[PDB]
Design an enzyme around this catalytic site. Structure first.
Site, PDB file in Angstrom:
ATOM      1  N   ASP A  74      16.145  17.339  33.896  1.00 32.41           N
ATOM      2  CA  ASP A  74      15.102  17.803  34.799  1.00 32.41           C
ATOM      3  C   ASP A  74      15.450  17.656  36.273  1.00 32.41           C
ATOM      4  OD1 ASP A  74      14.752  15.089  35.402  1.00 32.41           O
ATOM      5  OD2 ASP A  74      12.866  14.886  34.319  1.00 32.41           O
ATOM      6  N   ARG A 130      13.550  18.270  41.436  1.00 29.04           N
ATOM      7  CA  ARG A 130      12.898  17.969  40.167  1.00 29.04           C
ATOM      8  C   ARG A 130      12.307  19.286  39.676  1.00 29.04           C
ATOM      9  NH1 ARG A 130      10.789  17.420  35.824  1.00 29.04           N
ATOM     10  NH2 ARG A 130       9.626  15.585  35.048  1.00 29.04           N
ATOM     11  N   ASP A 175       8.947  18.235  31.179  1.00 27.74           N
ATOM     12  CA  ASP A 175       9.367  16.882  30.893  1.00 27.74           C
ATOM     13  C   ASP A 175      10.439  17.007  29.831  1.00 27.74           C
ATOM     14  OD1 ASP A 175       7.542  15.336  32.564  1.00 27.74           O
ATOM     15  OD2 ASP A 175       5.958  15.882  31.139  1.00 27.74           O
ATOM     16  N   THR A 176      11.670  16.693  30.205  1.00 27.91           N
ATOM     17  CA  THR A 176      12.789  16.757  29.282  1.00 27.91           C
ATOM     18  C   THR A 176      13.167  15.331  28.901  1.00 27.91           C
ATOM     19  OG1 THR A 176      14.514  16.563  30.979  1.00 27.91           O
ATOM     20  CG2 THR A 176      13.628  18.752  30.569  1.00 27.91           C
ATOM     21  N   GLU A 187      15.180  12.043  28.750  1.00 27.87           N
ATOM     22  CA  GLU A 187      16.097  11.574  29.773  1.00 27.87           C
ATOM     23  C   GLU A 187      17.257  10.726  29.277  1.00 27.87           C
ATOM     24  OE1 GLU A 187      13.947  10.046  33.353  1.00 27.87           O
ATOM     25  OE2 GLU A 187      12.244  11.083  32.441  1.00 27.87           O
ATOM     26  N   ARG A 222      11.956  14.039  46.289  1.00 29.52           N
ATOM     27  CA  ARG A 222      12.541  15.135  45.535  1.00 29.52           C
ATOM     28  C   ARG A 222      11.832  16.470  45.762  1.00 29.52           C
ATOM     29  NH1 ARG A 222      13.005  12.832  39.431  1.00 29.52           N
ATOM     30  NH2 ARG A 222      10.757  12.567  39.834  1.00 29.52           N
TER      31      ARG A 222
END
EC number: 3.1.31.1
Length: 136
Positions: free
Chosen positions: A16, A30, A35-36, A38, A82
């Site tokens: 992400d 970002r 939502d990947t 991590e 970010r």
């Protein structure tokens, strides 16, 4: 109305997160609305499919001729400095591709940064219906 702007890849950091050169300034980005799993999770470390979502984003932005970023209507940066945006690799949005391949869920939406929420929600449903990666 949202518009795409030129950016140059510096380094892919996670599924992400990607580091880009935006308007002469190096900057971390970002990916919006996703939502990947991590590999750099603050607590768990490396999650399932984490390495897969990571390689997917890496290749996609690394093998592209053109990279563009698209900010939404709300805040352009999160509390960690970010940049919050939609990233495109040769016309294809990385955010949607990840979700379509079942390598990420649609994150909790915060208005007014939800312009493509509908688009991503459909791709996630299709991915679930196909039981790809995360959904299997």
């Amino acid at each position: 109305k949202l518009h795409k702007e030129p950016a140059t890849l510096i380094k892919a950091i996670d599924g992400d997160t990607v580091k880009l050169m935006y308007k002469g300034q190096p900057m971390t980005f970002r990916l919006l609305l996703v939502d990947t799993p991590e590999t750099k999770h603050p607590k768990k470390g490396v999650e399932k499919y984490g390495p897969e979502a990571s390689a997917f984003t890496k290749k996609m932005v690394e093998n592209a001729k053109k990279i563009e970023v698209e900010f939404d209507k709300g805040q352009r940066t999160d509390k960690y400095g970010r940049g919050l945006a939609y990233v495109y690799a040769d016309g294809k949005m990385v955010n949607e591709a990840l979700v379509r391949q079942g390598l990420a869920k649609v994150a909790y939406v915060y208005k007014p940064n939800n312009t493509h929420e509908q688009h991503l929600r459909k791709s996630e449903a299709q991915a679930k219906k196909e039981k790809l990666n995360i959904w299997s």
